[PDB]
Ligand binder design. Structure first.
Ligand SMILES: FC(F)(F)c1ccnc(N2CCNCC2)c1
Ligand SMILES: *[C@@H]1O[C@H](CO)[C@@H](O)[C@H](O)[C@H]1NC(C)=O
Lengths: 202, 201, 205, 205, 202
């Protein structure tokens, strides 16, 4: 197979509306934010403007091909793929996607989508101008898929290594935990990754 | 049926342009706002910038499937579904939808659409910096379907999802049904009126 | 016919690019602005930010159906319909449409399209902080159709100029008047019709 | 032919991607700017925000029809037509098109496209608050077609270049001239033709 | 062939999603920024707003035609062409494309795409009001194609295109090739680093 054949096959048999669950197990989605910049912090309103690479990985076996005299990977427009419906619960602006909207698909059906996003958050900015700094928590999970359909897990120094040396701010620490929440309305559990960004004015 | 079959059937047959009225009775739409944030208040201009989850539910029987050895629910792009044409009558900006535009469809044809929306309103901001606070009324109803085609009802903690990091806090939320007749048009339009009583912390 | 049949027929035979002229008479378009809010006034730059409902009506006989044991009216996306190419000549921003882009179509082929629009205008803001107030004139007509293809008229008005106006605006409406104009430009030998809407308003108290 | 037939024929055959060159001569495009407003001037940054009608005319014979029992002209969405790839070389914002994106096509294949545009420019703002005023030059030509493929000329008439200017602007127009230029860069051998529009304007007393 | 035939052939056989690799060698992409204006500089936040022409060239042999009694070149909408997925790694806004989105295609399959772009960057603004000026580095490369799929290479007067009406003037522009390798993955991503040495005028 050449690139042209693989991309034709993916475009023609692309079910972008269909979550690729295997045998009623959840799709395991990995999410890791790599922080690039902190722009416009406001300690009065508790709002921050962040630029991050949102490293997103999952398996879609319907994309797989035999790699034996073929590329191992191709670049695919995300309009031709199912992508997880991730939202940041404490975002107060739409994600501004700064990069071309292409994912990498590996011959085994692994997808890597890593957009550069600028987005504004409501989070704790208190202490930003002190030595111990502020801790801004960003929560990301599926908007519509519960834990039996999508599971989200952090993956793990690249979370801070590629931060802009020209920001007014610096990163002290980044920690990630998984949360699984059931609300009173609804019997299902929703997973999110909580990313704690500890940063301060340089 | 698997998810792929159900989503193929919905995409091929859903008629997004067609209100799913049963026997010329109105489609009963439920609307409830969960307030998430209050971002910018201006007592001089009487304008507020709010973030809310707009919990919207209705039945569309044309979506229904037999759930025996099948999923009970699927996620569907709203471009593949009829959605009620709700507008906030006192909005002074377009709704900024912060979340993926997917609804949940249950095998019986119940649809749940809950976008997170940031929007600016013209409403009463007077008293925001006092103990009893301001009361901002938001009115949401069908832009083009009168009461014989769409009925809107509120659903049966006001701050359980509200950001602890807002400069503002919620004292009270009430959501009641109204019916409006304009000079233009002889029919009545139903709306839910949401009274947000809030103040500076 | 049910709603599904009517909407299928309209979607399948929709010529949105085709002005529905009858026997080489102009399409008669009614336009009336209902003011909802005045948001930002600048007396230095002579600029206003306004929110209005643009009540627009016309006939398209190709949409008509027999209403016997059928709905009298349906809601149709404007992407499935011809809509008049109206522009406000003194707008300095694109119209921000706040509402779902649906019109009402009556079984006789009457169309009613009433979007809520936020838009900025260049107009006379002088006197806004006086008792007699400012008079901001907004001119709306067809961008490309002359008087033999589109005629614009004011609608009927049977209410208060401020029946829908926000009680929370910094401004109040004293009066709204609408006149028809027919204008010939240097470019073009034909006459273009417009409605001129005079918004007389002032700062409150 | 009726409007529906003409618009169907144009949509099916117009080739919007194909420059309508006749016998390997350049397509003659006329450009004239009609100034409507000057909104924001900054003498420190040398930036202006202008509203203009960009009157654009050319011939496309592939659009022509026999007018003998037929309309002489139709309104056509520009998505169904080849349009020249005009850019203002000194623009520092995307053109904000304020008007419906329709051109007028005459039965002989003449096209008139006149969008109302708000756009920001880098130009000489020095002297804006003096009696003789500033002279801001705006340069408009093909982004990708050199002089053997597109020729750009001012229109023969510029009588009306200020006729439509807002009386409510903080600025007033002293003079407009529109003249033909060529740009060549040293790298690359082809000349690109442009219209240079010299807007002599000042702050009002 | 006339223009109509060439453009019909390109539109009908356009694989815009398919990188035109020849015999599994990388597509050689040339990038040169021609600076037109510097509009807003902030020495506190280290942010600049720039207007540049992004001169981009590559070969796509699937576009080639016999130029005997035919045009040497045509203008093609970029929606009908594969274009490299270039991103500026230190951009903090989406590229605002000011110009019609047409490329020039030569009969041998060379493509020239030169959009005018306004974009905001995080870079070193220190010294902008001094004689030696600031040096703002912009890094541009493929978002998803590593060095075996896309190579980026730099290509007269640094201020031949620059606005005489800017508050700023250009002292020097240099363009150099860089390579990044991330810890996860053995593949290198190439970029062009464009060093813009500029200052506030007298
Ligand atoms: F997480 C990072 F930043 F280390 C990482 C890992 C793997 N690939 C990356 N990129 C970012 C630039 N474009 C594609 C390669 C980046
Ligand atoms: C649903 O499907 C099951 C199993 O195939 C069947 O027993 C049942 O009768 C079905 N119900 C309806 C109403 O179709």
């Amino acid at each position: 197979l050449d690139r042209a054949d693989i991309l034709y096959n993916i475009r023609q048999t692309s079910r972008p509306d269909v979550i690729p669950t295997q045998r009623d197990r959840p799709v395991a989605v990995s999410v890791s934010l790599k922080f690039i910049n902190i722009l416009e912090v406001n300690e009065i309103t508790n709002e921050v403007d962040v630029v991050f690479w949102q490293q997103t990985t999952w398996s879609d076996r319907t994309l797989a091909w035999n790699s034996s005299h073929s590329p191992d990977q191709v670049s695919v427009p995300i309009s031709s793929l199912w992508v997880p419906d991730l939202a940041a619960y404490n975002a107060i602006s739409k994600p501004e996607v700064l990069t071309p909207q292409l994912a990498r698909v590996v011959s085994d059906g692994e997808v890597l989508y890593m957009p550069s996003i600028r987005q504004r958050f409501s989070c704790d900015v208190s202490g930003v101008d002190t030595e111990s700094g502020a801790t801004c928590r960003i929560k990301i999970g599926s908007w519509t898929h519960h834990s039996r359909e999508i599971s989200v897990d952090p993956t793990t120094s690249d979370d801070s290594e590629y931060f802009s040396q020209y920001s007014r701010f610096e990163i002290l620490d980044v920690t990630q935990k998984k949360n699984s929440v059931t609300y009173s309305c609804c019997p299902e559990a929703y997973e999110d990754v909580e990313v704690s960004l500890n940063f301060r004015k340089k």
